Amino acid sequence: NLVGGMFDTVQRSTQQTTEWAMLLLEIIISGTVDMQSNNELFTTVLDMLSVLINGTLANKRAYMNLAKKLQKELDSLEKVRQLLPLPKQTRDVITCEPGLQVSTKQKISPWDLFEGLKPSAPLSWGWFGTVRVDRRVARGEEQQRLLLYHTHLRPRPRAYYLEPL
């Protein structure tokens, strides 16, 4: 009820908008209020925040200036991510490093993943625990050659099972 009053005074400055943009982020991100306590509070607290950052435009350069200061700290997360700009995305790889557990995650831009170079330059083979093992025949394939001398009982012609009792 207070900060709804002098909100028109907030947009007069430029850096004081960002000084009052950050303090309320700690309140919403700490879970002090949730949906079950007050649905209407999250409706209110983002409505001046919608036009707090619109007041930066009405410059674009100031808009990315306080935006890069707000993803740096971080269903409730879906609502706060709707107002902030569309972020750039980088491809992720999940690394095991072994028994065999999982350890870390590495982020790589998609501009590096190309098949022009023969080995894996952005990708480390030790991330996966890759082991080069030698060639062997299929175990089902050698069983067919091994079956040729037994001549066991006749298997069913696979339509015998689909019959009335």
Partner 1 sequence: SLEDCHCNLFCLADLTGIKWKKYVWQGPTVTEEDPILSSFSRCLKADVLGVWRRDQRPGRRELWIFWWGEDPSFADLIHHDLSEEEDGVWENGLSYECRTLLFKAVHNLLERCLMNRNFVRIGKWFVKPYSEHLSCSFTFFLHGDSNVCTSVEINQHQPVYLLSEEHITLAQQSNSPFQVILCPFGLNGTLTGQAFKMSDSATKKLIGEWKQFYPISCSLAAVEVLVAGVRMIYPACFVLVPQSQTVDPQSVQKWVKFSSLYVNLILSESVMNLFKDCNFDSCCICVCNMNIKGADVGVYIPQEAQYRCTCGFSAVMNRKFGNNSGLFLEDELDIIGRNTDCGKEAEKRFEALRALSDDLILLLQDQCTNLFSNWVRVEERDCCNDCYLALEHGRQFMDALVKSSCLHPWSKRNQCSQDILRMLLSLQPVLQDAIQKGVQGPLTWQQFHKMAGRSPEPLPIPTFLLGYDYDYLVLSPFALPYWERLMLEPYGSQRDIAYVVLCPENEALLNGAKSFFRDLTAIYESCRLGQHRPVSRLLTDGIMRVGSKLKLYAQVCRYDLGPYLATMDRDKVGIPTDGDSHYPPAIVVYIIDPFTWTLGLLRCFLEMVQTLPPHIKSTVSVQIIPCQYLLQPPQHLKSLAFSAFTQCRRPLPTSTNVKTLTGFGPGLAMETALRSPDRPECIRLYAPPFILAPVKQKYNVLFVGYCLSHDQRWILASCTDLYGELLETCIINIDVPSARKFGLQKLWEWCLGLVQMSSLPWRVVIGRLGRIGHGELKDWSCLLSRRNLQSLSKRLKDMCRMCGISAADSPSILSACLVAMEPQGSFVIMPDSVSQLNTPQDTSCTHILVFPTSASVQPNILQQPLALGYFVSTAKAGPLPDWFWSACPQAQYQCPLFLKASLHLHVPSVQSSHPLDSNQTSDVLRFVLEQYNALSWLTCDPATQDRRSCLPIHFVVLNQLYNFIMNML
Partner 2 sequence: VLECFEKIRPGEDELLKLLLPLLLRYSGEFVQSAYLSRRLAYFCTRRLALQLDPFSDLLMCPQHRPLVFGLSCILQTILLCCPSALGSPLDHLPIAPSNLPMPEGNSAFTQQVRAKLREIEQQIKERGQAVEVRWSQEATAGFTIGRVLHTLEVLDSHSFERSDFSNSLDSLCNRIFSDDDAVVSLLCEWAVSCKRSGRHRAMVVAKLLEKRQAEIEAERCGESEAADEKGSIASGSLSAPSAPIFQDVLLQFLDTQAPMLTDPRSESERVEFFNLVLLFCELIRHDVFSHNMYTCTLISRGDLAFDQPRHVQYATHFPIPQEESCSHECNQRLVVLFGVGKQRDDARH
The separation between the first and the last C-alpha atoms of the chain, rounded to the nearest angstrom, is: 80
Q: What is the dihedral of CA 53, 55, 61, 64, to 10 degrees?
A: 0
Nearest CB to partner 1, comparing residues 22 and 113: 113
Closer residue to partner 2 in complex, CB, 67/96: 67
Q: Pick the closer one to partner 1 by CB: 64 or 102.
A: 102
Q: Say whether residue 123 binds partner 1 (CB under 8 A).
A: yes
How far apart (Å, rounded) are the C-alpha atoms in residues 34 and 24? Answer: 14
What b-and-e string marks burial along 18-51, b requiring 16 or more CB atoms within 10 Å of the CB? beebeeeeeebeeeeeeeeeeeeebeebbebbee
d(CA 75, CA 101): 30
- Stretch binding partner 1 (CB under 8 A), from 6-14, 39-47, 80-88, 89-97: 89-97
94 binds partner 1 (CB under 8 A): yes
Confirm or reject binding of residue 156 to partner 1 (CB under 8 A).
yes
Q: Does residue 130 touch partner 1 according to CB under 8 A?
A: yes
Q: Give the nearer residue to partner 2 in terms of CB position, either 87 or 164.
A: 87
Residues that bind partner 2 (CB under 8 A): 1, 4-5, 7-8, 43-44, 46-48, 50-51, 54, 79, 81-86
Residues that bind Zn ion (CB under 5 A): 150
